[PDB]
Amino acid sequence: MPMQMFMQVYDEIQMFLLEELELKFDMDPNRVRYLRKMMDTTCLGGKYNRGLTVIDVAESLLSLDGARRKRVLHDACVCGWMIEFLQAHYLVEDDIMDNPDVTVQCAINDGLLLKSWTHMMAMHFFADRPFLQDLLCRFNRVDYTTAVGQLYDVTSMFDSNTDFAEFTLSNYKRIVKYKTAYYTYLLPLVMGLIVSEALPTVDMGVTEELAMLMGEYFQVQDDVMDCFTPPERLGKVGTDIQDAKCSWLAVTFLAKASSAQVAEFKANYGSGDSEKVATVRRLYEEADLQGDYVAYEAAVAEQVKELIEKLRLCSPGFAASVETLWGKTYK
């Protein structure tokens, strides 16, 4: 029922958006079909973890009358597609960042449309909901937060706009929090609470802390996999070393390497050269970073498991949905 409902609502949102373009925006069929294909290409195919989290949160909060239920679950699905479309928008923007060219014009246009669609679907489906303004404001603030996170990320290896000054655990956590944790972990949880009209019934502090911790757990595992998981298993080519990213491996290595090992890391980091990437990997391996990875994740897991209990004392149904979100990350 969750996935089936989520896909049924996608068809509903898509038909609304496309009929609106045809009826109110003067769009010709060739362009409508082009946008149907583009929307399917960019919004479908993933795991829908962000979107499905909204549904899971709402169902927990209404179970713990069928007129309110049907409405809350539909609202949860629209909110879920708002986050999936926001994610689709970020992926398009990232694809331009890693590239009279009409393909680049179309990618920029696609990025703008996908973001505009999050507002169009909200303004329509939640038109007479009293939560519309708060939902829009929290969504916009989270989107802004992500752009700020991207600035921190993209400029991590620079400043005074090659320096390893910002290669610290505190800065790594700043990047993860802003760039990923707010829209991936916090926003789905918050949206599920908004639609359920149960936003003031939860300790936001513990929830924000949980979102940041789960985001941190996810990114550390993501960083390790980028470097060590082979492309056929990973589903992409890992480029963090070449890109000179402020990764968990890089910041952890710099705190435990010797002066000559740091000098060796500095001379080989941020290069496309196969042997320099391999030298970096050798340094991570020899510094027993994969042993430290196990313990770091376990300590984060202990903190997550503890905070869910504090949340469960005042918000039991919500804590079980935060538990399922965690199980999807801990997997």
Ligand X SMILES: O=C(O)Cc1c(Cl)sc2ccc(Cl)cc12
- According to CB under 6 A, which residues from 173 to 212 bind ligand X? 184-185, 188
Q: Is there a binding annotation on residue 292?
A: no
Q: Is there a binding annotation on residue 240?
A: yes
Instruction: Choose the stretch contacting its own copies; rule: CB under 8 A; options: 131-139, 184-192, 287-295, 304-312.
Output: 131-139
Nearer to its own copies, 123 or 278 (CB): 123
Nearer to ligand X, 6 or 167 (CB): 6
Nearer to ligand X, 271 or 303 (CB): 303
- Our finding on whether 236 is near ligand X (CB under 6 A) is no
Q: Tokens 């400029």 — which residue?
A: 155
- Distance between CA atoms of 144 and 26, rounded to whole angstroms? 31
- According to CB under 8 A, which residues from 24 to 53 bind its own copies? 25-28, 30-31, 34
- According to CB under 6 A, which residues from 23 to 82 bind ligand X? 47, 49-50, 53
- Our finding on whether 83 is near its own copies (CB under 8 A) is no
Instruction: Choose the stretch contacting its own copies; rule: CB under 8 A; options: 7-15, 19-27, 42-50, 252-260.
Output: 19-27
Beta strands in 151-216 (DSSP E): none
331 DSSP assignment: -
- Distance between CA atoms of 25 and 145, rounded to whole angstroms? 31
- Distance between CA atoms of 260 and 265, rounded to whole angstroms? 9
Is there a contact between 201 and 232 (Cβ–Cβ < 8 Å)? Answer: no
Nearest approach in angstroms of CB 185 to ligand X is 6
Contacts of 187 (CB under 8 A, 6+ apart): 50, 83, 138, 139, 142
101-110 long-range Cβ contacts below 8 angstroms, 24+ apart:
110/38, 110/42
Instruction: Choose the stretch contacting ligand X; rule: CB under 6 A; options: 112-120, 130-138, 163-171, 322-330.
Output: 322-330
Kindly tell me the sign of the dihedral angle through the C-alpha atoms of 109, 111, 114, 118: negative
Q: Is there a binding annotation on residue 95?
A: yes
**Residue 49, binding choice from its own copies, ligand X, none, Cβ under 5 to 8 Å by partner class:** ligand X
- Distance between CA atoms of 304 and 293, rounded to whole angstroms? 16
- Distance between CA atoms of 22 and 297, rounded to whole angstroms? 50
- Distance between CA atoms of 130 and 310, rounded to whole angstroms? 30
Nearest approach in angstroms of CB 231 to its own copies is 19
Paired tokens of 265: 């890391």
Which residues are at the interface with its own copies (CB under 8 A)? 21, 25-28, 30-31, 34, 93, 96-97, 99-102, 104-106, 108-109, 112-113, 116, 119-120, 123, 132-133, 136-137, 140-141, 143-145, 147-148, 150-152, 154-155, 158-161, 174, 178, 242-244
Binding-site residue numbers for Mg(2+) are 94-95, 98, 153, 222, 226, 240
